[PDB]
Amino acid sequence: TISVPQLDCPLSRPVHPEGERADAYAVEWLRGVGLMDAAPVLAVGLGRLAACYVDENASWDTLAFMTILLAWYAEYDDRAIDSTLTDAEVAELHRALGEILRDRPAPDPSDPVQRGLADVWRTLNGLASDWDRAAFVDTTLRYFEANRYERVNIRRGIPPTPSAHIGMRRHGGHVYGMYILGAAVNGYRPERRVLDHAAVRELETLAANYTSWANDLHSFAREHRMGQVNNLVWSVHHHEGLTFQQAADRVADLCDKELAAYLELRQTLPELGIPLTGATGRHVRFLEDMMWSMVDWSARSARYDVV
Amino acid sequence: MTISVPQLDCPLSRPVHPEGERADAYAVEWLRGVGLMADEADAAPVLAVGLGRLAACYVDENASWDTLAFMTILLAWYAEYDDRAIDSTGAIDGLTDAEVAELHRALGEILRDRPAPDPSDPVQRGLADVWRTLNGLASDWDRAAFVDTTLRYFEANRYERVNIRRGIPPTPSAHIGMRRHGGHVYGMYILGAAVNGYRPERRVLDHAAVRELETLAANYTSWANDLHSFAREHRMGQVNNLVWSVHHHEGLTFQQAADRVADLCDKELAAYLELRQTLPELGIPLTGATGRHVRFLEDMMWSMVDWS
Numbered sequence: 183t184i185s186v187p188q189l190d191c192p193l194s195r196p197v198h199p200e201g202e203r204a205d206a207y208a209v210e211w212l213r214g215v216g217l218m219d220a221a222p223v224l225a226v227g228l229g230r231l232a233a234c235y236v237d238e239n240a241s242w243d244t245l246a247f248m249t250i251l252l253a254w255y256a257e258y259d260d261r262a263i264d265s266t267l268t269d270a271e272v273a274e275l276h277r278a279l280g281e282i283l284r285d286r287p288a289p290d291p292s293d294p295v296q297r298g299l300a301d302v303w304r305t306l307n308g309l310a311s312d313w314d315r316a317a318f319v320d321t322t323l324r325y326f327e328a329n330r331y332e333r334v335n336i337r338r339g340i341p342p343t344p345s346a347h348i349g350m351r352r353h354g355g356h357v358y359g360m361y362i363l364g365a366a367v368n369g370y371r372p373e374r375r376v377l378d379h380a381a382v383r384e385l386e387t388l389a390a391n392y393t394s395w396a397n398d399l400h401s402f403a404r405e406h407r408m409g410q411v412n413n414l415v416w417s418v419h420h421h422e423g424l425t426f427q428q429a430a431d432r433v434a435d436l437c438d439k440e441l442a443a444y445l446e447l448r449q450t451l452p453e454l455g456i457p458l459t460g461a462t463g464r465h466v467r468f469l470e471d472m473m474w475s476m477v478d479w480s481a482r483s484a485r486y487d488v489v
Numbered sequence: 490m491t492i493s494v495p496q497l498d499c500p501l502s503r504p505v506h507p508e509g510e511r512a513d514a515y516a517v518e519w520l521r522g523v524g525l526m527a528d529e530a531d532a533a534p535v536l537a538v539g540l541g542r543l544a545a546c547y548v549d550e551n552a553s554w555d556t557l558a559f560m561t562i563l564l565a566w567y568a569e570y571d572d573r574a575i576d577s578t579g580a581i582d583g584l585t586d587a588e589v590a591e592l593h594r595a596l597g598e599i600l601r602d603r604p605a606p607d608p609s610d611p612v613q614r615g616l617a618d619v620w621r622t623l624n625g626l627a628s629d630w631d632r633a634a635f636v637d638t639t640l641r642y643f644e645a646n647r648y649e650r651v652n653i654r655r656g657i658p659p660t661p662s663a664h665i666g667m668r669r670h671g672g673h674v675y676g677m678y679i680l681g682a683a684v685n686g687y688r689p690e691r692r693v694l695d696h697a698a699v700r701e702l703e704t705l706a707a708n709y710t711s712w713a714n715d716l717h718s719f720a721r722e723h724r725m726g727q728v729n730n731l732v733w734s735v736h737h738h739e740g741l742t743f744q745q746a747a748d749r750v751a752d753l754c755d756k757e758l759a760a761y762l763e764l765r766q767t768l769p770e771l772g773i774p775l776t777g778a779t780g781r782h783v784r785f786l787e788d789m790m791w792s793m794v795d796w797s
């Protein structure tokens with residue numbers, strides 16, 4: 183067995199009240215769309231994560247789209263990346279899903295993932311709010327390429343160097359795309375003058391690092407049973423020669439240090455000329471949400487139980 | 490009050506351009522001809538820096554004297570600006586924040602093909618000269634990407650000077666993140682593509698693997714530069730050094746800090762090799778311009794190690 187370390191995050195946030203309802207809605211959508219007994223899915227709690235990602239006074243339509251998006255993400259990652267399909271099949275799937283992102287109809291309406299992604303795209307564009315869709319599509323392309331990289335690593339059966347995994351994981355979790363979608367769906371648009379600043383980019387990188395290392399720390403057991411070798415705990419144990427417990431301890435230590443660096447940069451931001459006032463403030467707060475979201479939600483989700 | 494700097498074996502060797510020594514002399518000439526230095530000054534530390542040998546590391550062996558000369562000019566202008574604005578702060582030669590902001594504005598104006606607002610400033614004269622010569626020596630390149638990297642470079646300069654005025658080194662993660670902008674490494678990749686004759690397709694450069702490999706190589710280059718320049722930067726007060734930050738926040742002696750920095754260099758080089766070797770399976774062949782780009786990435790790693 184393994185002992186999951188604790189993660190002190192000085193960032194708290196209230197959850198949306200209809201979370202349980204969204205859980206039910208999640209199953210409905212999947213069964214209504216064709217991606218999929220309904221009480222092992224309610225235990226995962228895809229609607230409560232969505233509740234962590236939306237504002238407290240948000241419409242059922244918005245919270246519903248958040249639940250739909252997180253449910254589609256969970257199905258693609260598990261179905262296509264780490265529960266193996268051939269590489270050619272995966273490449274054609276990437277092409278087809280990229281075509282849906284090109285506003286064309288689904289090339290294979292019989293594929294459940296393709297229909298689901300078309301639904302997600304239509305629903306997202308309905309609550310447009312005037313967002314940079316092209317940047318989101320670019321992050322999605324990098325996400326697909328990183329998925330292919332992960333599948334290569336799984337086929338070899340050995341974890342990459344910690345540096346190589348840490349680099350590619352930011353694309354493999356599509357965290358930057360989640361930042362873009364959060365800006366789109368909630369109703370704030372940060373200036374392009376601010377986002378292209380080096381300090382903001384490195385702050386985003388720190389926050390994404392914290393989120394992804396926390397996710398690895400919590401999901402290590404399920405990812406090890408399935409053979410998903412793209413885990414920071416895996417690589418630390420393999421290349422630094424440490425026990426799984428020592429590896430998890432080292433990863434939690436790295437999480438702590440990255441959080442400290444994140445706070446240091448956030449405090450330095452005003453002096454450089456970037457005030458955390460308007461859309462910049464809500465963007466930084468969204469960055470803070472995903473870090474707390476992993477710590478609080480992963481311990482409450484039935485994704486990681488091995489019962 | 491001493492330190493022992495560890496060695497660094499990097500298995501990337503290359504034949505050097507023969508006229509390197511000439512460029513060293515030419516370097517001093519340019520610095521005298523533009524106004525950055527003058528006449529009576531001992532031209533023994535400028536020949537000791539070896540700006541022409543770095544230029545030789547950055548060009549092909551069968552290249553024109555014009556090419557080596559421009560590389561030396563660019564590396565000499567970068568070295569003077571770094572010392573003038575970043576490393577000579579906290580002293581009587583220190584620049585003010587208003588002066589640095591005006592320099593940013595004017596140099597950005599020179600970078601937008603406009604004439605220098607203050608032709609009396611030597612930095613502006615040198616940058617205008619570099620810009621005119623470079624625009625003559627090339628074409629079909631991403632100029633906008635280079636200008637954006639320059640904007641991020643200036644922003645990182647502002648961050649570093651704030652950190653210096655506080656008198657405290659930043660967190661290791663925050664330092665590692667912002668250093669890539671503070672070292673103008675991505676701009677150097679773009680310029681290397683520019684001065685040579687290779688242009689890799691955008692389908693390849695925008696690939697996720699190519700982006701993260703660049704990050705590993707830039708990390709290695711910058712950490713090596715810090716490991717070697719730690720003693721001088723610690724004496725002068727430049728707090729943006731990885732050894733300094735390891736000593737400050739990780740609770741280690743200066744020797745342990747340098748040892749950890751060298752260990753991180755080793756581990757990052759191994760990671761770089763792992764990704765570089767795996768690259769073909771993902772669909773990126775190291776054949777045409779992509780191979781020459783990777784060779785430039787490897788060159789900057791070895792050049793910094795040797796140039797101590």
Ligand SMILES: NCCCC(O)(P(=O)(O)O)P(=O)(O)O
Nearest residue numbers: 255256259354355397401485
């Ligand atoms: N957006 C999809 C996120 C999926 C994961 O977070 P999970 O731990 O839930 O499997 P990953 O496979 O990245 O570890």
Ligand SMILES: [Mg+2]
Nearest residue numbers: 259263264354
């Ligand atoms: Mg995955």
Ligand SMILES: [Mg+2]
Nearest residue numbers: 259260264410
């Ligand atoms: Mg997964």
Ligand SMILES: [Mg+2]
Nearest residue numbers: 397398401405
């Ligand atoms: Mg995981």
